[PDB]
Design a protein around this ligand. Sequence first.
Ligand SMILES: [Zn+2]
Lengths: 116, 48, 710, 198
Amino acid sequence: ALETVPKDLRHLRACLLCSLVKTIDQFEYDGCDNCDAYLQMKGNREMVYDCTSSSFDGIIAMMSPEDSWVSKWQRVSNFKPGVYAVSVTGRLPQGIVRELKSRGVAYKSRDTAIKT
Amino acid sequence: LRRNEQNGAAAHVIAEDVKLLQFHVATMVDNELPGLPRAMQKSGRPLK
Amino acid sequence: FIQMSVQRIVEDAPPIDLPPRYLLKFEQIYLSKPTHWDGAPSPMMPNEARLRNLTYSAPLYVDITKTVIKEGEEQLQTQHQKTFIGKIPIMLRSTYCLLNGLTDRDLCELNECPLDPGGYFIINGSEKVLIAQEKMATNTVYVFAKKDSKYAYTGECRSCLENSSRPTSTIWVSMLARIGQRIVATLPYIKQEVPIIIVFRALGFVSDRDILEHIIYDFEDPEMMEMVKPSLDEAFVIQEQNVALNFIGSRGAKPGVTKEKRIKYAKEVLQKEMLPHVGVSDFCETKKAYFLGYMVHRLLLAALGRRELDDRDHYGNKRLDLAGPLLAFLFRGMFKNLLKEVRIYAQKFIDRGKDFNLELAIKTRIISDGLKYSLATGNWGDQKKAHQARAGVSQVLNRLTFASTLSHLRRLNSPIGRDGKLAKPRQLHNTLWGMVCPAETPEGHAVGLVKNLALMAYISVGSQPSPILEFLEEWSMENLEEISPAAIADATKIFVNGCWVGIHKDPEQLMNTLRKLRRQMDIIVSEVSMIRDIREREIRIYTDAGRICRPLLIVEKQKLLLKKRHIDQLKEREYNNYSWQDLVASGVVEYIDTLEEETVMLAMTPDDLQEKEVAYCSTYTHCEIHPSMILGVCASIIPFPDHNQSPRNTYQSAMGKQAMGVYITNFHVRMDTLAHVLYYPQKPLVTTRSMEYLRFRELPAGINSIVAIA
Amino acid sequence: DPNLWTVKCKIGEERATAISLMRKFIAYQFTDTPLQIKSVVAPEHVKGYIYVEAYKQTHVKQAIEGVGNLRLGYWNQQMVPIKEMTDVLKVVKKSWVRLKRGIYKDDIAQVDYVEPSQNTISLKMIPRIDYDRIKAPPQRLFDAEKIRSLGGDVASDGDFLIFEGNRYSRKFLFKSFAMSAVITEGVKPTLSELEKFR
RNA sequence: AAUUAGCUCUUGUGUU
Ligand SMILES: [Zn+2]
């Protein structure tokens, strides 16, 4: 799955629902591999800006989600393989959160960062 | 080391940092240390 | 060095190959005369370089063939002709020096003294000279008994094939003192030793009879087998080759945790590190086993007391490295560093897929600056870790008096560490007769460790051993690979440069034929040395560089080959074209080296020691030209030196280099530091004949004064 | 759970190494030599080595072959404590700012105007320039007449100036710099900077 | 009133 791999290291961003690290250009051109069926990232830029942010810490090159404890720790065991962020600070919009809750998806923040 | 343990506290790079600090402190007062690398500057000559 | 060794090194370097790749092969170095440049090339005179603090060096150019090969068979062999590599300094008055073969008028027109001997470099405007460094001879078996260890005897053998980037590898076969006599082998590149039987099994000789055949050539005096019996016994669990390979690989520098890794490691170190000179080809065990067995046989002979131990101070066992070998030593690593840098640049530039311009890849600064630094400071090695290697190889030439300059260009250095309690290397060995001056040596802390060449002494430059090999094989020599081991006992062994090759049945005719060929200088050049041992049926032939030799007159039965005809033809020389080389070609004189001197019979003087009197020897083979040629440059200016005490001769040899006098004719143009020159030097009223060739009558240092002893 | 290992990597190029290994795995799972590596972790601040999650060290050695960044860690790897795994995923975290790059590193800048484009912010600085006199510097008041006398790359708009380096000055440089090139938290200027700008 | 480390060479002690 080379489509998930970012093509460069410029303006990388992390998905607030999947911790998926990807370039904003690929977010507009392709979109999140796991939020496409729920948010439809492809075809717009401003909604991508709202959904994903460039402030992220750490990178994990995950390729075997079914045989790793990191996937279990990061709640990304059932998500598609790809580069993931460790801790992301931010919150999804209230309307998007309500829509996800309506569509049977519970919003869990990825902010595992320590606040002092 | 101080800045790393202030926030990071990785507890593994800390071991490497304290080992390196031990090495440098020891070489500061004794350079010809048996079985250890010598303290050399960017000249190929061991320090004094 | 310049003519052959640089080309040999550049071709010997392995091809550099690494998403396609390239070829990047080097060949056909091109070298030009020294030139200096917002300017254009133009030749630099040595005096100009000495005055402007330049470096008397010339550029080096090499031919490069680059071929990029990819899918679809799209490769182009583009050739870059004469690519710049770096500047190499030139020894003055050499073949590539601008002052080559010029008449005295041209030298005077260039403000260069015709009496200047040359033989030194000019680095940063300073005159640098290379001291000839001695070392133990390589590719030879030496047995020394040491009382400071558990080893009763040890057959050390250093080895190096031909100017290889791999450092010389040492083979130690040592017998423990204490059953008993546990013969073991200290494999290089391996931290731990290993019994010899295990190694022999690893080579692939499971048959015990074969192993003893390679060790012992006789089967009716059971002393060699008595001593090897315990050594056979400890290696009783190892029979197959694979388990021996595992046993050896379990002690390697990278001991593989898995069995196959240990097998591969031991196999590689055996087929590439152990005994390189005999061969590191695809397979050479058929001769490597014989060589190792011969080493073990010499060790057993030493243990038996049947052959005396070798002497470390015997100059037949020593080699002198001159400027050539040392510069080759530097150039090997320097070219390796250049190749590493180019490979790193290519690695960085091909990841992006772009094609690199090799003109920017080659850095001149790696070859020129490193060589200049090592030749200037004397630290002979890499600049970053120079203290690991020796220091003081390159010194500043001593232009105080002409005798001092001459004596500084003929200097031999022993690398024995100073401040050492040892005194045996400092003594004057018997073998230093006619090779090294017995009186000229420093009186400081380095007494006996710094020496000077004799007047007639010469140092072998080296030659390829192949033509001797073909001539010897086309004779009754039987190669080692197809001889029954039972025939070794009743025959004589043949060694060339220490490598055991073949076997022979009739050694007398072989020695006579080789001597005739060397006299006729048709196949055997005059530098080659041949020796035959009688008690042990061995014949050793040496062609390597670094051997010190001297000329000697030849005697057939009781009279010299030299007669009035040769003397007449040589008297009218420089009118006809009869010279010393023609005297050599006539088979009248011969170059004898210190190892061959052991098996010859010298007469001090023809008339006195070859007529008919009380029969002392009556079987002389060689005669000395003149006995007073054993002295050096400084010691040969002493009048009646055989009437003084030897320390007085040593003191005079030391102080002759401090005497005030005209050190060079053109002292008015040289801006040297600390120049002393006397107004009225005088030719000595009483002189030796030897100082006629030292140019002392043309650059004297001293005055004849009316001395009264009162 | 599979073990975790430290593999030595080149300093400054740690981020590209994880992508390189991921690309290698994606290229090689179909092939006859699939990467039996489990995951690759690169901390934000840990430099010189990269975490590799795999069952055994042999898996690591086989998988990291051919990668230039992991040559140092190709031969030798170290035991990572299990009780460290959790801490591996633990990451800690009209105004005044300080620039990060250029010749104005660690220099006080007063945030004058915050542009809503969220690209660059206007900042007021004290010129660390020599007015193009020696170059062909401390903090000192901006001398317009000096730079007008010396000439060169200078454009004048009365109290406004545009000079060498695309530098805007008024009365005091008023220049736009990215928020990623400055620090927006933890400057805390003193009374001396107030006069300059328990 | 203007530095140091390293290296090399050399001088005196080689007497009975
Ligand atoms: Zn997502």
